[PDB]
Amino acid sequence: YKNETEAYAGLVAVYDVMRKYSGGFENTVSFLNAGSDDHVAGGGSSSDGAGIQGFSNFTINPTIMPRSYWSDFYQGIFRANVLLTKLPDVPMDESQIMRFTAETKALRALYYFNLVNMFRNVPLITEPLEPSEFNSVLQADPSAVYTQIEQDLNEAIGNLPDIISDDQKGRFSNGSAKALLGKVYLYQGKNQQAAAVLQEVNGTPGQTSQYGYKLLDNYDELWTVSNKFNSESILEVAHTNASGSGWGNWGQGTDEGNSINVMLGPRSYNQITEEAPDLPSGWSFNPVLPELYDLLEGDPRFEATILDLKALEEAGAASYVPGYQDTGYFLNKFIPRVTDVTTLTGEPVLNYRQNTYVIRLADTYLMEAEALGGSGARAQALLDAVRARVGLPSTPVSLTAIAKERRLELAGEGHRFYDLVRTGKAAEALSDRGFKAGVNEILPIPFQELQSTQIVQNPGY
Numbered sequence: 511y512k513n514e515t516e517a518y519a520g521l522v523a524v525y526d527v528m529r530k531y532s533g534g535f536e537n538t539v540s541f542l543n544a545g546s547d548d549h550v551a552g553g554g555s556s557s558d559g560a561g562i563q564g565f566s567n568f569t570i571n572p573t574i575m576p577r578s579y580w581s582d583f584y585q586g587i588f589r590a591n592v593l594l595t596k597l598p599d600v601p602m603d604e605s606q607i608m609r610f611t612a613e614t615k616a617l618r619a620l621y622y623f624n625l626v627n628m629f630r631n632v633p634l635i636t637e638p639l640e641p642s643e644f645n646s647v648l649q650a651d652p653s654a655v656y657t658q659i660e661q662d663l664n665e666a667i668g669n670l671p672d673i674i675s676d677d678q679k680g681r682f683s684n685g686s687a688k689a690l691l692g693k694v695y696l697y698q699g700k701n702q703q704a705a706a707v708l709q710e711v712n713g714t715p716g717q718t719s720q721y722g723y724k725l726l727d728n729y730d731e732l733w734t735v736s737n738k739f740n741s742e743s744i745l746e747v748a749h750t751n752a753s754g755s756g757w758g759n760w761g762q763g764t765d766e767g768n769s770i771n772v773m774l775g776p777r778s779y780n781q782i783t784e785e786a787p788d789l790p791s792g793w794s795f796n797p798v799l800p801e802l803y804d805l806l807e808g809d810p811r812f813e814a815t816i817l818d819l820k821a822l823e824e825a826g827a828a829s830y831v832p833g834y835q836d837t838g839y840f841l842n843k844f845i846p847r848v849t850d851v852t853t854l855t856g857e858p859v860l861n862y863r864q865n866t867y868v869i870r871l872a873d874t875y876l877m878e879a880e881a882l883g884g885s886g887a888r889a890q891a892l893l894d895a896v897r898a899r900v901g902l903p904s905t906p907v908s909l910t911a912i913a914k915e916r917r918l919e920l921a922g923e924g925h926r927f928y929d930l931v932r933t934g935k936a937a938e939a940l941s942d943r944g945f946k947a948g949v950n951e952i953l954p955i956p957f958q959e960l961q962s963t964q965i966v967q968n969p970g971y
Contacts, residue, residue: 527586534761685721771862794833
């Protein structure tokens, strides 16, 4: 790296891997949604995405598990590993070496957290591998991987800015690193450490935290496509329509479009009257299941969350054509209107531009309340604030009331499956979909990652 500019381009390339949440077909959010009790895979037929269909009915196995869920995160980690060796020597201000270094560590932590949650048993690699180190590394115990995640985030925190300027938003601050660390603690049952750091993140619930975090006054504006990096955003993936993606680069690093936006829309949609929205057609992935519909139906977050094509058909206001395992209910939060269709160069369906909340403030309120055991005045105030934002009265705080609130607040944002697994509720919630206890809490390691390596397959696969 001759200079800052080059160094920064190297850091951008580490950040790019966050588009794996919502970019390309094999993104994490729609796949995770498919394995929860709120959605199935959907799509056009039983063979439409062998991996996501396999997760959705728990026949997933090492042959059909997409390799990109392993390799893409490792690609981001290896980039961060090399870049940490190069930053100290860059001819630029020391304060920028310090910032870039902290952001790189925060990213490595995030990507390792993604791997441990999906796969649990993974090699711990923190330095550029010699050609021989590479093919011979062993899986680490998850706790070692967690120790590295915490260390990375503990070293970053204090070395980032607290407040990020509007044109840099999307980059790590002390606030979003803390929020991530809080979640990391929570995911290991380190409740006291979780509550303590989340308190810093959240501040006084219902007001503005020290990091500028505030719940939006209207829940529905969270899903306004142009309302990017709003006050509720903590960690957010940037998508755009200006990359001009075509079929030739769909799902590569140069493709910045939001693929969840095309994947989730209804098929052959026609707007008959103005009572229905004007929508481009999509591929009917992540249909909303009736259990979630019935929970949300009288709830204020119903219209924002669920596009009720059943009801619109019944009123004569629209028509559509059912995809695979259609329910008539669709995940409205990420379904573009015709006003969201690009006018810039590129294929229309590949250049949708909604961002993705990796962490938002309602989620950190709910995580802190949980970390507090669902008990006491602070936990109550945190639950109260989430509910009040949508006009719901106070309800007595408890672990059960928090889990219910999370399901209504965060539906379709990719958290339900891991929430079920980490709280020990997954087997019971998903047994009827084919989930097998002691097996399907984690996913199979893609078969090709075992060939010529020391990697061992996960239990029961």
